[PDB]
Structure 1
Amino acid sequence: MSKARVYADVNVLRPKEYWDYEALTVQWGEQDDYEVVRKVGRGKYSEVFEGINVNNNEKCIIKILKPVKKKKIKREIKILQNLCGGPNIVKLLDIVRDQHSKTPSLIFEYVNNTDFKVLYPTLTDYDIRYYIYELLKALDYCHSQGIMHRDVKPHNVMIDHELRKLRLIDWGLAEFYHPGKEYNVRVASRYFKGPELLVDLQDYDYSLDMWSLGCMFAGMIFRKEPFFYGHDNHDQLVKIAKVLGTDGLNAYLNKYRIELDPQLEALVGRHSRKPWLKFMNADNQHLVSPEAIDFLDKLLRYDHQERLTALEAMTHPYFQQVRAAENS
């Protein structure tokens, strides 16, 4: 059995109105209020367009959803509403649907994002600490509100580099945390899936997002996209084991009485732990200081219970200049 070490009782103490999302009655806005200006992305669940609010002429993001279950859509909407106004949490502006096709569209605030594939390589040491700190704010906030994002990755972190503004988006996989509840491990994107998901540990918690954040952090300071590059869920665990080592994995599995599928256990094999500095090179030298390594080490732990919480991460000395700057 496993439970979160913080914010475990948030949804226990709050009224059903807060977490009983299936009771939500969607209030639709007016589709004609928003017009498409250009497509900016696509995905398995939606088509994304930069749009504009014809009323106030303000930019927005229109996500036209592909067929989705009433249950799933209400969950994303309820969570967005609960987190409204939180630090760096994307704002849901409106919800509309096309009467004839019944196609729903979610309207979000616009963020002039620079593809991480091009942005990250230009980030300085300070930029990295700054943006990761900002992302942490959003995570501690949602976790403090009894919610797990479950899909933290560069594609879901919008950044207007010019304005140094960051927003954590796409809460379609997020879930409310309930002590002891068994969740579906089929969440997050492969390169950012934590060990718990890869070994089928279902009673995971907020800590899952901290592994994901760590993967992003490792990618930034080591200049690797992504850091753990696996081809399928089994290979993903292998790539991880080849870094943290199998000793740590076995200890993890024995602590939670988990048995790897024979094939998987066969693929992982046996590996030694590799020091983080073995990934340093002339390209990521100006970014891999001892503080960065110490912080990364405390995030990428097999045991989700050992990882820093978002609040702890924000206080790590690695971020001291970012904190000092803010309190000005």
Structure 2
Amino acid sequence: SKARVYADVNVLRPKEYWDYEALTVQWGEQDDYEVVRKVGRGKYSEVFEGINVNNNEKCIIKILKPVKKKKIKREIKILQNLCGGPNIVKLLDIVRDQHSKTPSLIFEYVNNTDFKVLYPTLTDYDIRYYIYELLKALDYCHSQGIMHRDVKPHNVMIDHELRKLRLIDWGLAEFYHPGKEYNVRVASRYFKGPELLVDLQDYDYSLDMWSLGCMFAGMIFRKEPFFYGHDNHDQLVKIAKVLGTDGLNVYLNKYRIELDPQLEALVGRHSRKPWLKFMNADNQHLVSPEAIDFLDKLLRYDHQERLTALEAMTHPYFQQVRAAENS
């Protein structure tokens, strides 16, 4: 398998672009930044609202939990290569604590609303709008030869007042190289594509499009998250019970994948369920046939069949957002 687009980005660029292990970090001054309050955390870090003591401007301080220098260098290089891209978080400085040598990444401040409370109030247009803004970020990073690999609501920060969106936490992101076998232990379970769940390691940018599709389905059907599996095997089962196993086997046969017999039996056999069946009274105002058409073109087992981020931005579902932007 290879990416259908941007497959040669890292082939054509200087090895210094993608050879993140050769990174030399120019450490800043830890004292330039002061923690104000904790605003988030995950397995790999804690995130704080901070203040830049010099200009007294707000910023974000991401304190990294203990990990190999390789993973730290990877996130830093990706952030530096993407800096300035549309809707990409801006890495401003990198500092470390002397004694502990705990690294912190400093970002421009981002002022988000809890997705669990925001999403229920989004209008159909807001959905279309925010999804389009997220697409810009994904098309940009893919175009720069990078896969995010952890698209989920928690990593999409939205300032609803200002209608500003930022794709954050590049800690799981990787550089795309044709034929490379990547680790499938990426993304949040509910947003993992089938390729991850069936051990297809030579995946690509299209993984992020499945994740986006999961988010999107969640939003239009008001169902967070949409595919609610308890473990990785259950995750594929829940996907199979919607998409159907026919397409699953077609997919498995095309890429010559054999499922684990245990997994094969959990999955079983299931007919495809039309998207409309998920329609209900709470979600009805958000569910145009254009919504369904777009969603159906994202949530495909076959990563090669999925819309690219570029194609997605041009789907008629987004026509009003494009018209508005074009002024």
The interval holding the TM-score normalised by the smaller chain is: over 0.9
Q: What is the distance in 2 between the residues matched to 1:147 and 1:72? A: 15
Q: Counterpart of 1:36 in 2: which secondary structure? A: strand
Flag structure 2 segments of 5+ consecutive residues without an equivalent: none
Tell me by how many angstroms 1:123 deviates: 0.3
Tell me by how many angstroms 1:42 deviates: 1.4
Report Cα offsets for 1:11-58 as digits up to 9, x if no partner: 000001100111110011111111111111111111111111111111
1:237 paired to 2:255: no
Tell me by how many angstroms 1:108 deviates: 1.2
Q: CA RMSD in A?
A: 0.5
* TM-score, normalised with respect to structure 1: 0.99
Q: What is the distance in 2 between the residues matched to 1:317 and 1:43? A: 36
Tell me by how many angstroms 1:262 deviates: 0.7
Q: How many residues get paired? A: 327
Q: What is the distance in 1 between the residues matched to 2:124 and 2:27? A: 44
Tell me by how many angstroms 1:193 deviates: 0.1
Tell me by how many angstroms 1:182 deviates: 0.4
Q: What is the distance in 2 between the residues matched to 1:29 and 1:306? A: 44
Tell me by how many angstroms 1:10 deviates: 0.3
Residue in structure 2 matched with residue 307 of structure 1 by the alignment: 306
Q: What is the distance in 2 between the residues matched to 1:109 and 1:281? A: 40
Q: What is the distance in 2 between the residues matched to 1:44 and 1:179? A: 30
Report Cα offsets for 1:231-277 as digits up to 9, x if no partner: 00000000000000000100000000000011100100100100000
Q: What is the distance in 1 between the residues matched to 2:127 and 2:4? A: 27
Tell me by how many angstroms 1:207 deviates: 0.1
Q: Counterpart of 1:172 in 2: which secondary structure? A: helix
Tell me by how many angstroms 1:97 deviates: 0.5
Report Cα offsets for 1:54-84 as digits up to 9, x if no partner: 1111111111111111111000000000001
Tell me by how many angstroms 1:222 deviates: 0.3
Q: Counterpart of 1:305 in 2: which secondary structure? A: helix
Residue in structure 1 matched with residue 12 of structure 2 by the alignment: 13
Alignment of 1:211-222 (within 5 A): 211-222=210-221
Q: What is the distance in 2 between the residues matched to 1:60 and 1:212? A: 28
Report Cα offsets for 1:176-205 as digits up to 9, x if no partner: 000110000000000000000000000000
Tell me by how many angstroms 1:310 deviates: 0.2
Tell me by how many angstroms 1:169 deviates: 0.5
Q: What is the distance in 2 between the residues matched to 1:240 and 1:110? A: 36
Tell me by how many angstroms 1:112 deviates: 1.0
Q: Counterpart of 1:76 in 2: which secondary structure? A: helix
Tell me by how many angstroms 1:104 deviates: 0.6
Q: What is the distance in 2 between the residues matched to 1:75 and 1:51? A: 24
Residue in structure 2 matched with residue 54 of structure 1 by the alignment: 53
Q: What is the distance in 1 between the residues matched to 2:120 and 2:56? A: 34
Q: Counterpart of 1:102 in 2: which secondary structure? A: coil
Residue in structure 2 matched with residue 249 of structure 1 by the alignment: 248
Report Cα offsets for 1:200-238 as digits up to 9, x if no partner: 000000000000000000000000010000000000000
* TM-score, normalised with respect to structure 2: 0.99
Residue in structure 1 matched with residue 133 of structure 2 by the alignment: 134
Flag structure 1 segments of 5+ consecutive residues without an equivalent: none
Tell me by how many angstroms 1:109 deviates: 1.4
Query: Deviating runs (4+, > 6 A) in structure 1?
Result: none
